[PDB]
Amino acid sequence: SDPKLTKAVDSICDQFIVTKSKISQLTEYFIDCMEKGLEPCNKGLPMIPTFVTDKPSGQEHGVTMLAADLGGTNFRVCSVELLGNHEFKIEQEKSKIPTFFFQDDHHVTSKDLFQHMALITHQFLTKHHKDVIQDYKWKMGFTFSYPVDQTSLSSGKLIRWTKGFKIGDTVGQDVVQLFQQELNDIGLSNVHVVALTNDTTGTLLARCYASSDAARAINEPVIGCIFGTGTNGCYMEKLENIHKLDPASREELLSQGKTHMCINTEWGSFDNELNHLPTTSYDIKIDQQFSTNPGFHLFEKRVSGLYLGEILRNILLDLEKQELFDLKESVLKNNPFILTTETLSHIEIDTVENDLQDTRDALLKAADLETTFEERVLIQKLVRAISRRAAFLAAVPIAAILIKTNALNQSYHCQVEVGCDGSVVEHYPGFRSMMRHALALSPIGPEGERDVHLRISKDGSGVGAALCALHANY
Template sequence: MNKELKNRVDEICKSFDISQDKLQELVDLFIESADNGLSHNSSNKSFLPMIPTFVTSIPTGKEKGVLLAADLGGTNFRVCSVTLNGDHTFDLIQSKNPIPIDLMSSTSNDLFSYLASKIKSFVKEHHNENFNSDSNNSNKLKLGFTFSFPVEQTSLDSGKLIRWTKGFNIPDTIGKDVVKLLQDHLDSQNVPVHVAALANDTVGTLLARSYTGENKEGLTSIGCIFGTGTNGAYNEKLENIKKLPIDILNDLKSKNINHMVINTEWGSFDNDLKKLPVTKYDTNLDKISANPGYHMFEKRVSGMFLGEILRNILLDLYSEGLLFNKYSNLNDLPHRLKTPWLLSSEGMSLFEIDDSTNLIATELELKNMLRLPTTLEERLAIQQLTRSIARRASHLAAVPISALVIKMDAFKGHNVEVDVGADGSVIEFYPGFRTMMRDAIAETQIGSKGERRLHVNISKDGSSVGAALCALSNDL
């Protein structure tokens, strides 16, 4: 790289560095924000949402039986059958059904009738014998319903839709119990299925890892997702969930229940930007996002946003006359480079580890993804910037995990090991992400000794196996 470009790239990369002091400040703020979220029902922007899930038991891996899971996550509706073998293993059958475009803006009846019909077809194909059983709940297949839209959950098997996202717009569903809607349509179509739980994919990740983990590496206490988005769930003492209504609290205590899984919604950590690092590229990204001022943690960590940060930097360096000098003005730049969200984290994962001669793999990827020809000097700059953005993301990812381990006092006892179940494309596939995250965990208050006792393991099928296990929660 020429000296001017190198100095500017070094300067930008330095702005993405996170010091040990900053990491520890963020951990302290996360714990404070989590405590406030557990105590207040208000949607205060400064607090973490800390949503009670009413999942009150964690699997051991010895559970047996056949359960169903249904997942409405966006443009597809998945139905799964999970056979728990009682030895930490399971067998999975699943089907995927695209949601017809017209149903995404139709009526509740149309949408939930369609969902029920797909569950009916699945049960007829794979569990037809259940159609001959009695109609009471004890003989119905239990189903966990992953509904990936904002809901106000009031029990394990009920939750009112707050708002639609992801292109859905069905006004008559707002404020209605989505579990009841699905159950009513299942009943009207005589489907022998009982919707036993409203599930969350992050909670599912925790439960799925608890079932499969065999506790060889300690009790699974946290489930987390680092993919397109990011979120985490953990097992909290009932006495600390101060926002639970007193009648619900007393009812749970009367059943000798003393813990509940909390969905932290940690993508919203530090929306006020008290401690999170802020560069001008973060500010630019936030302005063009769908929810300016919210999910500020997620916008620095998750796969949806990492490529957009890099794209912003490249345009900035072009405007300073340091990159892509063959283009005499902005209008001449490849359209894809000027279009938000087209530079992907998948592409960055290739830039991260490219050791080919003259970074030819990076050259081909940039031409394919952005129609952008580059020089070797430009590719070297892009690789250095990529590594800096990913390193910051991985170090920030260490904050909520470390904070929750401290908050739970998870290392209490002699030589206790702690297991974390993780899912998502970034933590599973981005080169070195987990290793860099662990390096940062060692720099938090947990220290290197604590980091060695913390095990982060990939937990697959959270929205299917985990949702099915949610349906068992009352029985575990």
């Protein structure tokens, strides 16, 4: 019960507090950054057009689409059978990405990556659709959740590799052409990649297709966002406000009956100048020393589940330098990311009436960190401070979008749906509960939070991609 340690922990916890005033300030600045990014090309969000202008109804049926997803660990290819009535049949296969693609001393080229993806695609069709592999007229949606300068539904150039990829010659190239050329070269020229999509876009479309007609009567999906190891979100913006879009293209869509286009905000790079975002010593150390892309996606680094546990590690290391916390032969030193957000899951809701056994056990399993009960009480305070900051900042982009689009007060009993995927928002105990708190503190107030629904929406990288491809031409 070292009072020096206790006073140190309380002061560190106070550095993570996000006040009502701060939420308001960031919500206003986020809308400003949204508008700057919609202007033609800054301190504005990427606000990247996705060229998706139609939300599915849920009754589309009578078609089978293909979908491919390149992630940080696996490459997935699947077939999506739309059955109507909010249902679908899906067959999928995942294969690990060779580790050579994440190491930069192997002369890895874009042809190596996209030829391997074409191979996996060929293996999938040979297994699940052998009779129609070379004959069928497949339409495929390519889920590519990386910074991409999208110029149409089927064309976009890689801006920067994230998630640890190390393929240099992909930057600046249309990834749809790179993938299509390899698909042609292995005898799958009948597989046309007709859509380039994000996991955020897919999450929104997937929720629109599964959202029942009775549910969708008063509920309306307005946002598709991810809160996992990374963060991002998308929403529907009025065509008139997307000034960076070719004004001639705008009129073409307006005459065809379109009124909105989904925007990939890429809000992980929100306020990278840190003009208003919080910043602790631990946030700076994580950015400049333990990040694959130092200086980028700083907002992401304050909410993502990849860094939450690391924030705690650096807090305990700093407490050990002050001779306030005894690591007692642990393995926290010189082992970045050894404390994961999963470790914190067992500490967040751990009960003190159990002498914090789950906390004791969770720390021994991760780094053989032996602890006293009084130390665990204080470690829990640090964890709860870390997660609340992430949860409160996570609500800012959502609040900003609902205010800009004036989506809450659209009709009597108007309810809005925020489709959410990701390890943190889905499984971190009380994360969504704390997001709802921040929303109630944000300018939408308690009245608005009551009409907002954070609903978990899975299958974004499969059904969502298939839906983008349905309306496009083979």
